[PDB]
Symmetry: D2
Subunit: 252 residues, 4 copies
């Protein structure tokens, strides 16, 4: 198969991509960093089993991989955006506007992009790596949330129509997924090093730990394998127990 | 209390506003047709208990109702849009934008301009008029539907930060809400006078009929009354027992 | 008309049974204590506007309220059961049949009793008083929490078939709803008193307070009044914003 | 590691035993007929790779598997009970008790029986094969719908507690699942051999095809492999798009 993975360096890209590559797929990797040739180069060096594309814009990115690698069989729209809290009256309209464009409009394009070619041949898989915040909203983060829920309903609606040309559609919304080196959204520090953050993570995720790239990677590879296409329309909540709820006074 | 019904001429506007003024409120009324000094006077003649505003903009409007009627106690962001039934690749990426700027960005643009003045009084109510399409998505309407899901989620998210100031925030997701003269989204023509359509209503709705303005106006006014701010963060499905799932061969 | 409220001395009992009477209905009231002619006489005493019953079984009560008061236009299955917090291997399978029996079996038995008459008169309103627990469970409450889920769903499944008959069915799932002296499930002792139970109830909710019987009643009477028929099949989370999710460390 | 798969001859039961074993899992099965020697033996003889047990009571089944095969690492509760459509009032309260008993008490009891070992050792996978009816309740299948519901929350609620003992808990809820020979609940005829039903599935599912036993089995195997435990608490709608919402008039 020929896959794509956007923002490979953040959120869930190195976990998706490599599990994808480990499975012998052709994985083209999009990252804004890959705008600088000094960058894309070392990446295509650090991971020779991957394919970092300089192509920035949605549709042209699809074009690079398709024309460079025959086509694109799976789309893993790993979308990211700085979740910078703010009571509603302190944000700005462009603040909300910029999250919808990077968490909502962005993946819609990629599909409006690759859509025709998967449909023509009757094959392809589409996966949005959204976010589990809607499943449980914190206070003061409305812009990023409404943005994530928007994408999730898109994947679900996108299935009632796409099951036609045999293209399963799903969305994996993460919460507390270890981003390691990446600041999007839970890096090693302090998330694993600090006692308050680790005690937080233990208290909020049922599993009492952070999530791994390998875990998400296994699911995308499984969804992207046709082994269970009948799962289409599903909104996967990869938050290891989250959101954990508050027990009454007394109950330890 | 002083209420604000947007697009009072369409969708849930006339239902809310007329019954909002019915329950005692000074209902300020926004509508794009009221940009013309002409129109703002046409509708006013039709309804003397309503107060039509010419202001189109979120901040100017709220600013106007503030300087016009003391404050803005209740906001009914009765949003509308005339999307399209298109296969993902048949929409322009521009089409999704507008859908988001409509069903999503506007309600937020309003909340962002009124939220400020409400938090001081530690009183107020926010009601979004959304859609019940996220509950049961239709193939080829991934825009309008998902945008609405964005508005719904933003409504629930905002409930998180606004309740700290005792401000309820809800969303009402209609479906088959008879709209009358308004082509948003179930005008009497032909949903009540055309055999094929009439039939589509009776077959997909539990009550088997379009809902009434009095019904949608009752809820809005019910929520806006203070009778149960404890529902805050709630999304109402005003789709009337809808959706109905087709049953096995033979079954009626 | 005539409406019935089960377990009226508990849960959302008082709020529903006094508000329905306020709205103008003849409210036959059921309750465990009404087994004793004294209790029924003492209740009917304190509240000559409510109609306490002796009947204990589903068809028994409804058939009795039919012969005495003409018919049963509204039914509020105020269900309860003293929940338990145990590791699932600590429970006894019987304990689940107890939860299931009272939380799902009682409501189904009643509707199975009344459906018929409402169906013939194409008029009637059914309300279920459940919980918001299936939305933000608590560990070790697997019995009650899940049992309620089937009740929440029992209500939803019905609204589809009873809608061709013009009969709405609603599910009210509250939580942290102060119940006076009723340990079902938030008595003033020790929730409106004990600082420990005060800080907590004041924490998992966006409104920071228990919900009031007044809010439960307003909603019960709003739905039964027959003003918003179109919300049929709706489940209401009367949790006042519950739950508030533990934000990361360092955040207020 | 050892696995159990109940009612193996029906529902998701076979795909379950078949895929699991192929993975290297010893799979101890359960099934009413296994109660008869000839029954169980032809099974042990037909499916040599499988390990059928004669034990049928939940309490009885566990100690026996834990005996012959040391322990129970994976619990797959494949709960059945034939659905009996009919208006709510024609239903006998015993027809809802019967549905729940077999769909809520049975799986609760199994975990009750097997938990502490999985908890004590701190490893194990719990998987409930419930249903997708609560996703799109057809008209008139109440009892069986709200039943699958409780079983679904049972799993979500349980995952919250067993997350400390590291035991993911899942609920795979299918519809249109091909049960080959089994009548539970989609057999060969007429689903794959009656233009009528092929046409029904052709409309209600997005993929206009039924769900294979292999896809279900494959989901069963992946969920208990340790590859994506972070999905703990997830309800999986395995219905290939069901339900497809009938769009407005004139649309193809
Ligand atoms: Br491949
Ligand atoms: Br918020
Ligand atoms: Br995350
Ligand atoms: Br929890
Ligand atoms: Br509508
Ligand atoms: Br409660
Ligand atoms: Br089977
Ligand atoms: Br099925």
């Amino acid at each position: 198969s020929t896959a794509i993975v956007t923002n490979v360096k953040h959120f869930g890209g190195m976990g998706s991509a490599l599990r994808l590559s480990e499975a012998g797929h052709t994985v083209a990797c999009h990252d804004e960093s890959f705008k600088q040739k000094d960058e894309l180069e070392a990446f295509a060096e650090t991971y020779p089993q991957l394919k970092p594309m300089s192509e920035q814009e949605p549709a042209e990115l699809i074009e690079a991989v398709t024309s460079a690698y025959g086509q694109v069989d799976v789309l893993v729209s790993n979308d990211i955006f700085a979740p910078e809290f703010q009571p509603i009256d302190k944000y700005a309209v462009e603040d909300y506007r910029g999250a919808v464009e990077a968490l909502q409009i962005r993946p819609f394009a990629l599909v409006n992009a690759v859509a025709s070619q998967m449909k023509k041949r009757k094959s392809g898989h589409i996966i949005f790596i959204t976010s589990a915040t809607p499943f449980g909203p914190w206070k003061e983060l409305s812009t990023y949330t409404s943005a994530r829920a928007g994408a999730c309903t898109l994947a679900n609606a996108l299935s009632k129509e796409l099951g036609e040309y045999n293209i399963p559609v799903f969305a994996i919304g993460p919460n507390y997924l270890h981003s390691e080196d990446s600041p999007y959204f839970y890096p090693t520090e302090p998330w694993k090093t600090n006692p308050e953050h680790v005690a937080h993570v233990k208290k909020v995720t049922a599993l009492q730990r952070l999530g791994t790239q390998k875990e998400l990677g296994e699911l995308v590879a499984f969804l992207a394998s046709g082994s269970c296409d009948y799962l289409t329309g599903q909104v996967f909540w990869l938050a290891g127990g989250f959101p954990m709820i508050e027990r009454w006074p007394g109950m330890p």
